[PDB]
Design an enzyme around this catalytic site. Structure first.
Site: not given
Ligand code: YRE
Ligand code: YRE
Lengths: 195, 233, 241, 211, 242, 236, 210, 239
Positions: D1
């Site tokens: 990001t």
């Molecule tokens: O890209 C991202 N941030 C950018 C994109 C939008 C805003 C900026 C982040 C990058 C890492 C974030 C780290 O902090 C977390 C906080 C809480 C939870 C989790 C991580 C673990 C969670 N995990 C891991 C595997 C199972 C699961 O649930 C997970 O990584 N979630 C993804 C979401 C990706 N997509 C989901 C649906 O579609 C939209 C985005 C996610 O948060 N990524």
């Protein structure tokens, strides 16, 4: 780390800090304004530590002291302010600690110019000079060596300049931007210094 | 019940400023068997009238004179159930003090705590005041004490006093013959004489209870035989 | 007094609710008109003196972007209800990502109003100690098009095509009944509203003593009327005979 | 990001990439990292996707209620304080939120950085995310408060491009919004950085570029 | 059970609170309590209510009480309610010292206790406290102070004042005789005069007088509760001067 | 905990407890607030026994926070508790927003508290009406008046307390806009003395500006009182 | 353990004939080796006959001192008398134990006079505590703080029964100074208070400052 | 002065609870509703109150669950609280047990909700009656009263001047069992018409009608079908 320096004389107290806002490996700002908390009635709280904890604790203290002064239509004494600050920090120490170091300064007719040194464990004592942060290791001996009673404001500022030059030269973080709060003669002045 | 909308004061101010429930509790006390206490030179005595309703009742089962702690005794005029509750509370407060400070509770401190407890029941919602007066006698570092506690929660410091039935006449009798330099024996005789003058008929070792605290000794309730000796003369 | 707040009368009516009904008959008169192209709310303001700032007092508040409300009875109670409705409408919008239907807002308001009955401890506990003594007109535009709803201290909500509240409720309702039509266009709704208000207003109608808002179906956005809009309406009014 | 924003003489530029990751797997390349808090305040998302989305929509709700209740527009400073207090209340719980709040209000143009640790820093130029050091270096190297709108947009685009080029966590599309006195405009809705590389670094397209 | 509720905290048809008026009647029915400020300290004097010659008149002050080192009060009204509120105010002063590491300003203490009283008049369904306080003290902010509280939670500062029965006579005497710069002796003699004239007599009686004062001398604030002997000396001086 | 409904609807449809609180307010002293371009003048009657009561202690005109002040009429103790609640809310607002509370926000909060105390079991309403002078967020000066029922409005000039009708009618025909500080002070003194005995020691006057709240000196009040006495005698 | 090394410091009590003395170092440490203050007294006056020495974590020292001052002031205003030293000692034990499982990191001593009212006799009174309120009543001396072992050696070797005020002062000062000279995290001044029923003598010793 | 009708926890010397009886009295003031059932169907019909000319008719019948609906008479807000309770109980039962709730258990829970509001001085009885129509293995009609009692019926009616409808229902009770859905609807509508004021009629605007049965989830009747039924009723009333 946030370098804090305080020096009280017969006729003044001076506080100083670096003006850096740090987010990991980058400086968010070179003119941070989240360290000094001017409080109505010739009082000043200077804080170091994490920015979030600094903001929370400092604004809480400032608001509560302002509330006290509005409710009782009077200025809180400097010593009362210092011990209220210490007690609130000590209350949160064993529940949800504010990891912040404090220098508390002020003037009032009862006690003249006062400086209190308080650490993140809420260990507090009144001092003639004090410092917080890793740069304390590098400024404390200078404070000891060049301080004397009857020091003038200009002399104290020269001492602070010595401290800033030492921090720039010998401290691993080359701090070169500083802000100072000078309390003397019933007025509080702000200065910025680059070395 | 004890919470919600049903917790309102039952003792309230009248137009003249009086709290009539306290007055009525006072009347209830003034209709009760007399009690009295006397502060002598080296001790304090509390005495009471214990008139057995029937030959069937066991006198020892009823003691109107109780010990709160070593060196502190208590007697009451008024309702006995109220007295039991307050005596239990007094013992509890004595031990609470003793646990905090190690030593025995000072008489004044106990009296103030109990008076505050009594006062609460003239203001808190949903209750009546206590219908009794207490005499609390004791010895501590600061001398001998004799305190009274009224149903309203006011407390008085006495050299000698009487509560209960026709206590004005008993008070005059007691003030006619009390000096601050009496001895324990003279005080006990005076208490017995006061009760005789009040009691209608002939008193005996079964009609009176007596408790003493003298010469820096633990509080003691005189047995039947000791009172009998005091009554021989 | 002698009774409790939750007492039934021998005819099966809550005394407190009935008394509260006698409080809504007071205050400035407001009229709501809902036609196919949008709902309009109009109200007279009873400015008490020249020293009072007109901006401050106001009888037409917006609950959401798509909902407005006219109020009568106790203004402090009405403001309490409106604040609650604003919070609830925005909570709905947060958890569903859409505008709340007007009828749902009316239901929430009515339940808040009846909270004093202590009928059930579900969700929050009872806090209100009496009815609100407020009648409201709540107009808005939702997916079902424009709609005008009325709520009152008893908690009954009724939907109208046109309605009136306040002191001159009855005269205004008589004028609305005989003049309202279902196929009226928006400008005719404005004319009818201001004509009724002027007919029942003790003072003479003017831009400063009348407030107007409308929620048009075209954009579903509550809009307050400034002086030019009120002047434009007042010009096309009929004669006062 | 990579998200960034900076003040210039015509307002505030806000630029972001659009990649979302689950571990090292690219979950999406079309996520929207600029969120309208209100008509005049934009928020950027860095860090946890759910945390940023939820708490910025929650802030939007709070601000809507405030602006209904008080019949005035909230300030960017107040919005940032509300958000920072809410986030600080969750300290130690493990929220991942890096947010830049930018907007116009009666005090002019304002910009604050708010992170999950409760940090709240006023400023004129911020960047958050894994790629934020690269955006910082580009911006600081070529930042002038007197740039026009076209120059400001071009600089934001180039900074985002370089961040996505060096950072595996950033990529997809660049969006550049412009905040002005009467709201905001989407100058660049979304432009694939694929074309940006063969526009800036390797326009010849005759051999592989060598870092 | 609502039929038994006396509705203590309910407005009367004239915007009056009847329980508070009755509590004030009770206070007006209590013995006189006076107070006055000199340049040497605050004087509090009171008439003792006779009960019996057997009361223990040694070290037994029942109308003037120490709240803190720099604060002390006089009581008019129900003594048990007063005992409750005095305990509370001692707690409040010590709490202020704990929280701020300095002694509590007098006005803040008066405000806290008056808040207790007002709350009883506004919340709940309990009767108000039937006590009026004369609170005097010293602090560096406002010097020597003297305050008067009533059951409604009201208070006000005074240079001299009286509460309890026949406060009108004592107040008139103070209005005629109180001066802006009096010495402690002059203040004590004037207190004796107003006590004697409010009790319907000419020479006061030591057995019925409680006198105490509070001085800030050499930096220490010190409270003196005059014994029967010291009061007898002052009575002789008063009978000399009048 | 007591929970009875103290404020209820009478058969007529009134909250009699609220009207009784209004009676209490009408038993209070008079207070007047006048607005100007960027300042407000607030005045209030003083009652103090001569030579025995201390005038510096009783405070009807008080400062809520940095930029807001309040005058009140009615029950003093109710006023103290409400004022302390309002100061607390001022500081809470500052903490939650990083900006001092605007005047309109504080007026709305005070009115909300009063309404709430008409609508909760086991509490009676506050017997106070208040005048609140302060600055909005656009730095405009405003004056709000709250009442025991909880209803509020903004005014160019308003009087509360005993005999407020006479003062209101006087202010209607004498208030102008953007009057200078001296003339606004004089108008406030004339308004207060329309219903209170003419004397310097019977009134306290303050002036509110962006900087701070400043009470007008004794000698200035006495000079203005002599001016009023002269105009009165010359008019008779 | 290391918590007590964070600040350093120690306190020492000693009795003579109709006299008793309490002494402490004056350092406020930080991070076990940085001296931030040289006027941080560990000695606190509860009343004229009761002193307490509080060594340990400075925050806990100040907090406990404030609690004890609150309790003593309330007790004495309610009772209208000075608190007896033994009542105070038992109260301090109870306060420390009330925090039995999250204790104040303090090493208190109590020094004063037990009054035996006949005329009044003044019997020296000394007590040392642990952090959960266990008590050690003694007649010769009490010690507490990180310097406890050195103070114990010095006292066991040098204490002399029934010394007059001057002998008491010299002995307690020598014990304190010798003990402090062997501690890295204590010293930087010493205050000595010598108590008699008539007067209190407060002295600051010309001590080592390294 | 009764001296016994002031509190809801006080028995009169005759053993009656007057506050609860007043709450019941509130039921007689509502608009009329009629429920009747055949071997396979329950039909509910009720009059929709109209406040004035410009007002929309009030709602009379409500869906509770796929095969459960209710009609009420009395204080509307009370009915709404009970409606929310029943809808939640049914949905929570589907959520927990993956099956449609037992109607007897739901009605008993409703009646216990009624009962709990009659034993404390700080509550009042619900001032509303519920007519409950469901199909659970068989058609069923239930009634709930403010006092906490409930009853099952074969045909039921309440509200203002419901005695005429009750007369009609008693007369033809024997028919309802074997009659077709169309005939059952005509019977319910005619019983409802028997409660009408002299000048009134039954119109699509002021008439609520719902059916629920063996394969027939709770469903209100549309304006076209309702209009055809009302026309048939009028025509065979002319006879
Ligand atoms: O890209 C991202 N941030 C950018 C994109 C939008 C805003 C900026 C982040 C990058 C890492 C974030 C780290 O902090 C977390 C906080 C809480 C939870 C989790 C991580 C673990 C969670 N995990 C891991 C595997 C199972 C699961 O649930 C997970 O990584 N979630 C993804 C979401 C990706 N997509 C989901 C649906 O579609 C939209 C985005 C996610 O948060 N990524
Ligand atoms: O003023 C107070 N009460 C007011 C606030 C509400 C209404 C009245 C009392 C003062 C009473 C003084 C008695 O001495 C003590 C008795 C018991 C314990 C402690 C001290 C030590 C404890 N300590 C010390 C540092 C870590 C810790 O836990 C501690 O000070 N407790 C605080 C409570 C603090 N919170 C209360 C609400 O406000 C926010 C903070 C506390 O007892 N205060």
């Amino acid at each position: 780390m946030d370098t804090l320096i305080g020096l009280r004389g017969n006729n003044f107290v001076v506080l100083a800090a670096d003006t850096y806002s740090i987010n990991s490996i980058i400086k968010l700002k070179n003119d941070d304004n989240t360290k000094f908390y001017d409080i109505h009635g010739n009082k000043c709280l200077l804080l170091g530590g994490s920015i979030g904890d600094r903001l929370q604790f400092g604004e809480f203290i400032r608001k509560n002291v302002h509330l006290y002064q509005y409710q009782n239509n009077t200025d809180m004494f400097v010593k009362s302010f210092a011990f209220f600050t210490r007690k609130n920090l000590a209350y949160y120490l064993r529940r949800n600690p504010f990891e912040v170091n404090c220098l508390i300064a002020g003037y009032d007719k009862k006690d003249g110019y006062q400086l209190y040194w308080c650490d993140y464990l809420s260990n507090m004592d009144s001092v003639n000079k004090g410092a917080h942060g890793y740069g304390a290791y590098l400024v404390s001996a200078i404070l000891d060596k060049y301080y004397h009673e009857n020091l003038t404001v200009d002399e104290a500022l020269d001492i602070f300049k010595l401290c800033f030059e030492e921090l720039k030269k010998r401290f691993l973080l080359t701090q070169i931007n500083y802000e100072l709060r000078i309390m003397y003669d019933n007025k509080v002045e702000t200065q910025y210094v680059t070395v | 019940m004890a919470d919600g909308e049903y917790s309102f004061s039952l003792t309230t101010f009248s137009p003249t400023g009086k709290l009539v429930q306290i007055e009525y509790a006072l009347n209830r006390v003034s209709s009760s068997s007399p009690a009295l206490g006397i502060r002598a030179k080296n001790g304090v005595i509390i005495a009471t009238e214990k008139k057995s309703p029937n030959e069937l009742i066991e006198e020892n089962s009823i003691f109107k004179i109780q010990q709160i702690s070593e060196h502190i005794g208590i007697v009451y005029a008024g309702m006995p159930g109220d007295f039991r509750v307050l005596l239990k509370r007094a013992r509890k407060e004595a031990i609470r003090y003793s646990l905090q400070y190690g030593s025995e509770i000072l008489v004044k401190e106990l009296v103030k705590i109990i008076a505050s407890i009594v006062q609460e029941f003239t203001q808190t919602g949903g209750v009546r005041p206590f219908g009794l007066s207490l005499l609390i006698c004791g010895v501590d570092v600061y001398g001998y004490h004799l305190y009274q506690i009224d149903p309203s929660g006011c407390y008085f410091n006495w050299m000698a006093t009487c509560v209960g039935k026709d206590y004005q006449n008993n008070m005059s009798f007691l003030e006619k013959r009390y000096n601050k330099d009496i001895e324990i024996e003279d005080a006990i005789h005076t208490a017995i004489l006061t009760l005789k003058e009040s009691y209608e008929g002939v008193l005996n070792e079964k009609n009176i209870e007596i408790g003493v605290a003298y010469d820096n000794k633990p509080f003691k309730i005189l047995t039947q035989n000791e009172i009998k000796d005091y009554l021989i003369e | 007094y002698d009774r409790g707040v939750n007492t039934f009368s021998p005819e099966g009516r809550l005394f407190q609710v009935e008394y509260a009904l006698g409080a809504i008959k007071l205050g400035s008169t407001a009229v709501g008109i809902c036609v196919n192209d949008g709902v309009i709310l109009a109200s007279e303001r009873r400015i008490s003196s020249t020293l009072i700032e007109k901006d401050s007092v106001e009888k037409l508040l917006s609950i959401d972007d798509h909902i407005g409300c006219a109020m009568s009875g106790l203004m402090a109670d009405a403001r309490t209800l409106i604040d609650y409705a604003r919070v609830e409408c925005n909570h709905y919008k947060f958890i569903y990502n859409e505008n709340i239907n007007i009828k749902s807002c009316v239901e929430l308001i009515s339940e808040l109003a009846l909270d004093f009955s202590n009928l059930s401890d579900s969700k929050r506990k009872k806090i209100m100690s009496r009815p609100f003594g407020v009648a409201l007109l709540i107009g808005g535009v939702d997916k079902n098009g424009p709609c005008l709803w009325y709520t009152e201290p008893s908690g009954t909500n009724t939907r109208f095509s046109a309605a009136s509240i306040g002191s001159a409720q009855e005269g205004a309702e008589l004028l609305l009944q005989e003049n309202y039509k279902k196929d009226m266009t928006f400008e005719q709704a404005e004319i009818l509203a201001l004509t009724v208000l002027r007919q029942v207003m003790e003072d003479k109608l003017s831009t400063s003593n009348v407030e107007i808002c409308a929620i048009k179906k075209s954009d579903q956005t509550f809009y307050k009327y400034n002086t030019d809009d009120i002047s434009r309406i007042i010009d096309v009014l009929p004669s006062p005979v | 990001t990579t998200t960034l924003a900076f003040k210039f003489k015509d307002g505030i530029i806000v630029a972001v990439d659009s990649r979302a990751s689950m571990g090292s797997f690219i979950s999406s390349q079309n996520v929207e990292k600029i969120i309208e808090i209100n008509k005049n305040i934009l928020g950027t998302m860095a860090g946890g996707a759910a945390d940023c989305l939820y708490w910025e929509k929650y802030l939007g709700k709070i601000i809507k209620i405030y602006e209904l209740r008080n019949n005035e527009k909230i300030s960017v400073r107040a919005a940032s304080t509300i958000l920072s207090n809410i986030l600080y209340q969750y300290k130690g719980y493990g929220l991942c939120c890096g947010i830049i709040l930018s907007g116009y209000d009666h005090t002019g143009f304002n910009m604050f950085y708010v992170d999950d640790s409760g940090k709240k820093v006023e400023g004129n130029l911020f960047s958050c995310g894994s790629g934020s050091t690269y955006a910082y270096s580009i911006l600081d190297s070529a930042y002038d408060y007197n740039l026009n709108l076209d120059q400001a947009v071009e600089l934001a685009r180039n900074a985002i491009y370089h961040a996505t080029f060096r950072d595996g966590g950033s990529g997809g599309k660049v969006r550049v919004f412009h905040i002005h006195k009467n709201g905001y405009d989407k100058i660049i809705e979304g432009e694939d950085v694929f074309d940006l590389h063969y526009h800036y670094t390797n326009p010849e397209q005759k051999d592989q570029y060598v870092m | 059970a609502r039929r038994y509720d006396s509705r203590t905290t309910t407005f009367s048809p004239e915007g009056r609170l009847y329980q508070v008026e009755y509590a004030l009647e009770a206070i007006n029915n209590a013995s006189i309590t006076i107070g006055l400020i000199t340049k040497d300290g605050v004087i509090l004097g009171a008439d003792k209510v006779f009960i019996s010659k057997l009361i223990d008149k040694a070290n037994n002050y029942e109308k003037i009480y120490k709240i803190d080192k720099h604060i002390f009060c006089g009581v008019a009204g129900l003594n048990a309610d007063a005992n409750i509120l005095i305990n509370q105010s001692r707690l409040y002063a010590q709490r202020y010292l704990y929280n701020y590491n300095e002694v509590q300003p007098v006005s803040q203490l008066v405000v806290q206790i008056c808040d207790i009283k007002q709350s009883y008049t506004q919340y709940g369904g309990l009767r108000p406290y039937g006590v009026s306080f004369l609170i005097g003290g010293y602090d560096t902010k406002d010097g020597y102070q003297l305050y008067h509280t009533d059951p409604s939670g009201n208070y006000s500062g005074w240079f001299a004042t009286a509460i309890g029965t026949n406060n009108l006579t004592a107040s008139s005497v103070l209005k005629q005789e109180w001066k802006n710069d009096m010495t402690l002796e002059e203040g004590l003699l004037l207190a004796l005069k107003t006590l004697a004239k409010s009790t319907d007599t000419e020479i006061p009686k030591s057995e019925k007088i409680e006198l105490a004062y509070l001085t800030n001398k050499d930096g220490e604030v010190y409270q003196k509760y005059l014994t029967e002997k010291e009061i007898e000396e002052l009575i002789k001086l008063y009978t000399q001067k009048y | 905990s007591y929970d009875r409904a103290i404020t209820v609807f009478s058969p007529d449809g009134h909250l009699l407890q609220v009207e009784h609180a209004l009676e209490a307010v009408k038993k209070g002293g008079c207070a007047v607030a006048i607005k100007s371009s960027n300042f407000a003048v607030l005045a209030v009657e003083k009652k103090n026994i001569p030579k025995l009561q201390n005038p510096k202690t009783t405070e009807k005109l008080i400062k809520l926070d940095e930029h807001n002040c309040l005058a009140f009429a009615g029950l003093n103790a109710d006023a103290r508790v409400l004022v302390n609640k309002t100061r607390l809310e001022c500081q809470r607002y500052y903490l939650n927003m990083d900006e001092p509370a605007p005047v309109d926000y504080i007026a709305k909060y005070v009115a909300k508290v009063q309404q709430k105390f008409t609508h909760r079991g086991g509490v009676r309403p506050f017997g106070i009406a208040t005048l609140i002078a302060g600055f909005k967020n656009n730095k405009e000066i405003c004056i709000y008046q709250t009442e025991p029922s909880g209803i509020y409005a903004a005014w160019k000039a308003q009087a509360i307390g005993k005999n407020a009708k006479i003062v209101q009618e006087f202010l209607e025909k004498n208030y102008q806009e953007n009057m200078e500080q001296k003339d606004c002070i004089f108008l406030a003194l004339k308004a207060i003395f329309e219903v209170v005995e003419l004397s310097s020691k019977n009134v306290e006057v303050a002036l509110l500006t962006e900087k701070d709240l400043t009470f007008i000196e004794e000698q200035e009040i006495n000079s203005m009182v002599e001016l009023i006495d002269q105009e009165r005698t010359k008019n008779n | 353990g290391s918590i007590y090394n964070y600040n350093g410091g120690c306190v020492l009590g000693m009795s003579g004939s109709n006299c008793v003395a309490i002494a402490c170092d004056l350092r406020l440490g930080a991070n076990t080796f940085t001296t931030v203050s040289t006027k941080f007294s560990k000695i606190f006056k509860m009343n004229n006959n009761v002193y307490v020495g509080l060594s340990g974590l400075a925050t806990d020292i100040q907090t406990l001192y404030e609690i004890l001052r609150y309790r003593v002031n309330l007790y004495e205003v309610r009772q209208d008398a000075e608190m007896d030293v033994e009542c105070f000692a038992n109260m301090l034990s109870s306060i420390l134990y009330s925090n039995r499982f999250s204790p104040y990191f303090v090493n208190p001593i109590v020094v004063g006079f037990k009054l035996k009212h006949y005329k009044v006799n003044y019997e020296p009174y000394l007590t040392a505590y642990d952090l959960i309120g266990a008590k050690c009543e003694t007649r010769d001396f009490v010690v507490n703080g990180v310097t406890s072992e050195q103070l114990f050696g010095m006292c066991e070797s040098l204490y002399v029964k029934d010394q007059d005020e001057n002998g008491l002062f010299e002995t307690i000062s020598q014990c304190l100074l010798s003990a402090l000279d062997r501690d890295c995290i204590s010293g930087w001044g010493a205050e000595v208070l010598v108590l008699t029923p008539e007067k209190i003598i407060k002295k600051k010793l010309k001590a080592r400052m390294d | 002065r009764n001296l016994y009708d002031t509190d809801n926890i006080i028995y009169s010397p005759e053993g009656r609870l007057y506050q609860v009886e007043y709450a019941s009295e509130a039921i007689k003031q509502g608009t009329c509703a009629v429920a009747i059932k055949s071997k396979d169907y329950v039909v509910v019909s009720g009059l929709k109150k109209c406040i004035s000319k410009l007002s929309f008719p009030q709602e009379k019948i409500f869906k509770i669950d796929d095969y459960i609906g209710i009609s009420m008479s009395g204080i509307t807000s009370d009915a709404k609280v009970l409606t929310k309770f029943m809808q939640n109980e049914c949905l929570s039962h589907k959520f927990l047990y993956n099956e449609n709730i037992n109607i007897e258990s739901l009605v008993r829970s409703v009646a216990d909700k009624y009962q709990k509001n009659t034993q404390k001085s700080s509550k009042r009885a619900f001032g509303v009656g519920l007519m409950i129509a469901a199909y659970h293995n068989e058609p069923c009609i239930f009634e709930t009263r403010p006092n906490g009692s409930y009853f099952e019926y074969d045909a039921l009616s309440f509200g203002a001047r419901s005695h005429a409808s009750k007369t009609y229902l008693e007369k033809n009770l024997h028919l309802f069992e074997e009659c077709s859905l169309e005939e059952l609807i005509l019977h319910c509508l005619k019983a409802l018409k028997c409660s009408l004021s002299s000048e009134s009629e039954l119109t699509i605007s002021n008439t609520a009608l719902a059916v629920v049965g063996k394969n027939h989830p709770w469903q209100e009747i549309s304006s076209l079908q309702l209009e055809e039924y009302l026309s048939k009723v009028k025509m065979d009333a002319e006879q």
